[PDB]
Amino acid sequence: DRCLIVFDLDTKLLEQHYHNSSWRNGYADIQRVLYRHRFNNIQGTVYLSERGVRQAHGTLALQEVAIRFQWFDKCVSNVQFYDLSDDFNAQFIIDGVTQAREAFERRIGMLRHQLLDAGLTSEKIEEIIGQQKFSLENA
Numbered sequence: 001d002r003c004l005i006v007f008d009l010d011t012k013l014l015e016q017h018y019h020n021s022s023w024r025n026g027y028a029d030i031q032r033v034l035y036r037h038r039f040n041n042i043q044g045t046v047y048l049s050e051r052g053v054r055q056a057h058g059t060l061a062l063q064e065v066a067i068r069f070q071w072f073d074k075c076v077s078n079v080q081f082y083d084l085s086d087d088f089n090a091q092f093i094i095d096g097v098t099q100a101r102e103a104f105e106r107r108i109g110m111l112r113h114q115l116l117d118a119g120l121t122s123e124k125i126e127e128i129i130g131q132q133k134f135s136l137e138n139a
Helices: 011-017 024-036 055-068 072-078 090-113 122-132
Strands: none
Touching: 055 072, 055 090, 072 090, 090 122
């Protein structure tokens, strides 16, 4: 109900999950949004919440998109927040946090000259950044 709709014959599992929720409407609400996304049955199903996309899961969905893609990990490192878009496949969602990373690689640069204006050297500007490995909350 939070991330996706399972539905299972186990009575205990229903009483527990489907005591204040819906597998049927939940599965309606699968379609209602895939319809909205102009989803072409490409693969998988998409499930939004009461809110839409969430900060948490949205970001959780990213760590999935890293299990699949290793190279994606730095982007997860470099992208903690990505405000998704309706009528856009996961495909596109992957290009945006790259776009985001690159952007965030632009913000690293500015603090790197703030270390050129500090006194550090060319190699040291590149040092302090990779040492902390710090990234913005809503990067």
